[PDB]
Nucleic acid binder design. Structure first.
Ligand SMILES: [Mg+2]
Ligand SMILES: [Mg+2]
Ligand SMILES: [Mg+2]
Ligand SMILES: [Mg+2]
Lengths: 131, 135
RNA sequence: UUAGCUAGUUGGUAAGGUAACGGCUUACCAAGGCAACGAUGCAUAGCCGACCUGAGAGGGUGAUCGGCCACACUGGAACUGAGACACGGUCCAGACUCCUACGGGAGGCAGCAGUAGGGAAUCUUCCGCAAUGGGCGAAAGCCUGACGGAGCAACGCCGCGUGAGUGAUGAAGGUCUUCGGAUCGUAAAACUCUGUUAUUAGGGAAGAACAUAUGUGUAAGUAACUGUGCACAUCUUGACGGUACCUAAUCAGAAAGCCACGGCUAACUACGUGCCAGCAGCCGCGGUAAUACGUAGGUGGCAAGCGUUAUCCGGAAUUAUUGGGCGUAAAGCGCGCGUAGGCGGUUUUUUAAGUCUGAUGUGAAAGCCCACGGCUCAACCGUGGAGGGUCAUUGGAAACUGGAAAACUUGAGUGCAGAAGAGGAAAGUGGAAUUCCAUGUGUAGCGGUGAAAUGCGCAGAGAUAUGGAGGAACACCAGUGGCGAAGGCGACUUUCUGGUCUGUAACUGACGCUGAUGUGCGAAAGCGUGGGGAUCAAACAGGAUUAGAUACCCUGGUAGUCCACGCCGUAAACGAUGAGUGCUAAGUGUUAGGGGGUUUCCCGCCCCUUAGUGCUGCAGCUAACGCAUUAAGCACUCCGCCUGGGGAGUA
RNA sequence: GCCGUCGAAGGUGGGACAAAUGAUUGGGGUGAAGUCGUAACAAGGUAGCCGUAUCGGAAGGUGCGGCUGGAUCACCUCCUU
RNA sequence: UUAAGGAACUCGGCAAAAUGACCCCGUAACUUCGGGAGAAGGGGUGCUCUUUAGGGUUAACGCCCAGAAGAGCCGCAGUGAAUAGGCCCAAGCGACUGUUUAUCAAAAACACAGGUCUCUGCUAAACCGUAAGGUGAUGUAUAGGGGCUGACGCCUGCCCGG
């Protein structure tokens, strides 16, 4: 029984960076693909390719590396996790890593990066840092 | 640890104790409570003047005196300095401060505010040992 | 180391009562009510705005100033009254103090001052009603220990200064000197200015003063400002205080100290001292040459203030939500069944509690912080700003948590065909071996030790053969092999019977994970009651060693080991590693299975895949040793547990 | 004026709680170089240690089971170029 | 019967007095959980009038039974006389309750259930008797006789020379 999907995604991701093989497999979901598009828009990802069969998944990703093969992030984690959910306003939100990384967040109008959430002055329920 | 296991207990700390455990005061008379005083000093009647040694590795005849206070308890004190102007039965004021000669003392009197007279064999730390300015 | 409390309690009916509702109170019917989301009982305490600290989350306190509350010698009751169950009012009882002709009466500073008392420690028995606010009045006015305001305290904050420029001779003089010289040192002396401040004398008696009453005219209303109810004008008011402030004159003359100097810590040399006197916040100095003791000189810090003590926060990530850990360092219960609770797979639709956003109100003032202005500047004062709620009300958004509804199979469980196993309980069977006895055989030692002895033995032992009884345990097999949740389980057979793994996939369609409190199983020893008693063997006896040996060694040897029903209820119960899920390099054996190729037939060979099982090993982690798909790696949930050691797993 | 309900204080009583106290007494901490012995630290000179029982002037010994945190010597067997 | 005092008498509170019934409130230590416990301590009780609950018995009448509420009356005193428990704390001995010295001792003695040892393989042992005979025993070693100790639970040490 999986208490949490965030752990599944972010842990297969980190474990895939530490070893550096490009591609990776996982059962899908609504939020996962939304945020995956954001990471592709970050630049932390090359590409993704959805695929479908009984019933969920597998959201297949192809990762990205420098020519000298430096891992493009250094770190990662969620914040808003079970037991202790957390939220933040539009003004209150963090600017991770003074501006480099990001802080994924959900809104009344969708899942987005943090920047669009402070510009719009709409906060919401934070999901994860990444940097 | 985990969060609800912190909810359903108040996350207790490691509360300290007193270092100069004079009862503070306590209310010797009347209407006994006794707390609280937190006085920085106390008078007390001394019913003997004496001297002992430390444990190893130091060795010196350290001069002390056992004293009944205002609050009517029983404690010990090393008097500092050269010469001691005191005897049996003599009133004297008290501070705190521990020395490592031994336990059996964690206080020491002050020189010059009351019966324990200031010793003027000093000129350097005259602000202590009861001294006043020479000329 | 506080788990049951409550009977007017809880609910109803009626009445009464109160400003009002109400078990607020009486009479009746009833047995409910409250509590692990901590009732109750217990000790401690006025609360809040705020203050201290901290970068911040937070920690501590409730002085002054302001808001709320209770109290007025203790205790009770009621009158007057709008309001009190009354702080300077009564009545009663009580303790206390006091007056008395002894019949009886009087009083209440936790109001301002002040006195004693305690305590380490907290001041004048001040002037005044000018101002502001009170109370009465028609007003003048009166009362105001509220209050304005003087006085004492270095209690604190802020501010100025105890002179400034030129002045070398490196004077005297101190100290030290490797005895040349260095050091105090432009420091002094001297020269030249100043007088903030102080001494004197003048002015100012600055503001704080607006006033009400007193005369003029002006509007509402009256038949009539005749008189009335209102805006301008003049008159007239200072406790502080002859203040502050100002103006001129006079003299560098009155006005500087405390602590420390090994490191932590900026700040060194000589004397005395010799484990003595002494210091100490820590680590530690000190037994004849102390940079740590005491003295001097000099230096650093600091300033009209400085050191110590007591208390609070920090540093402390040393309760760790931000921000910790459990293989070995303190720390994972022995393990299980499961309640309450906490957490929860996917898709769709909806809802709007949570959430986000916007607005309206409120969040007193003072204070904090920002901007500004005035007191000569600062402190201080004011202004205005921002700021602050787990806050109420209300309009919007729907991704997420949540509720309601519809659908799905991958988690879980049921199937169907199979595999294995020391998995458990009861009964049954058998061989060796030890022992006891009986018999036949036959003599002088057996048995034991490192060396001995004690014991058994001529009543013929032991040894040897036969057969008998009797209890307990089960050689090989047995292997890092298997099983089970752990403790544990190894002769075999039957009866009953629990779970596991694979393949399968039709089948229900999230039914799940963890698990406080509870409930139960739990090595060996131990205990009760009853049976049995072959070995082995605490206690005990004897022998020996030994200085001695109630210890090892030796000869015997009871309880006990054993069975059944019960009870305790622990361990190095160990892998000193909680349970569950998911992801991440290989190699190599092993155990039960499954698919396929080769083989005439795999049964043989090979390749693959599941589940547990062991070893070597990377990425990575770790303080190190080490772990490494059976994680101590990457993460999530849930539970339990730790906060220096002894005291003590004690009381 | 009298009577009645309600009514504080005081009085009687039996218990709960807490603190001070008391002949002797048990255990613990500490000190002079005390006396007796030498269990543990290596195979600590009989391996230790956890649990339990008993005996002992005492550390401790013995006994049943359990672990290696164990060594002279060796793991059935498996792993290693 | 006896004011004041209240065990000073006294070998000793011997005796005497006090308590004493019903209902209600309440009831500690310790405990073998049954009790202690009537613990203790404390209260009310009379006649009349009124109102009311009621239950048994009957066609019903009324006949019985024993409560509550109020309101009043009297006397010093209301279970008015008579009959009817004195209590608390602490200790040793004994566990009990029971029996015993008829006519001086009723007890800490005896017994008692339990414990333990030894005897006894059946016309059993032991026994009464000379012997038959009979008890034991319509019994058959979880049974019968003898000794010692005395509930419970903690325990039951050393010595086999005499
Ligand atoms: Mg495998
Ligand atoms: Mg009397
Ligand atoms: Mg008496
Ligand atoms: Mg008998």
């Amino acid at each position: 029984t999986m208490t949490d999907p965030i752990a599944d995604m972010l842990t297969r991701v980190r474990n895939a960076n530490m070893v550096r093989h490009e591609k990776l497999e996982l059962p899908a979901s609504n939020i996962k693909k939304e945020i995956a598009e954001i990471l592709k828009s970050e630049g932390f990802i090359k590409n993704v390719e959805y695929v479908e069969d009984d019933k969920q998944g597998v959201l297949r990703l192809f990762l990205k590396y420098g020519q000298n093969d430096e891992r493009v992030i250094t770190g990662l984690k969620r914040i808003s996790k079970p037991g202790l959910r957390v939220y933040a306003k539009a003004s209150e939100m963090p600017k991770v890593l003074n501006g480099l990384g990001i802080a994924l967040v959900s809104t009344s109008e969708g899942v987005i990066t943090d920047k669009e959430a402070r510009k719009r002055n709409v906060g919401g329920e934070i999901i994860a840092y990444v940097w | 640890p985990t969060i609800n296991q912190l909810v359903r207990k108040p996350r207790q700390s490691k509360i300290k104790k007193s270092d100069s455990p004079a009862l503070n005061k306590g209310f010797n008379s009347k209407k006994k409570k006794f707390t609280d005083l937190n006085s920085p000093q106390k008078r007390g009647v001394c019913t003997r003047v004496g001297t002992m040694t430390p444990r190893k590795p130091n060795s010196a005849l350290r001069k002390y005196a056992r004293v009944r206070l205002s609050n009517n308890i029983e404690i010990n004190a090393y008097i500092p300095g050269i010469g001691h102007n005191l005897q049996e039965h003599s009133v004297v004021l008290v501070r705190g401060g521990r020395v490592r000669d031994l336990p059996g003392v964690r206080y020491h009197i002050v020189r010059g505010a009351l019966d324990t007279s200031g010793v003027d064999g000093r000129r350097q730390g005259r602000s202590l040992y009861g001294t006043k300015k020479p000329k």
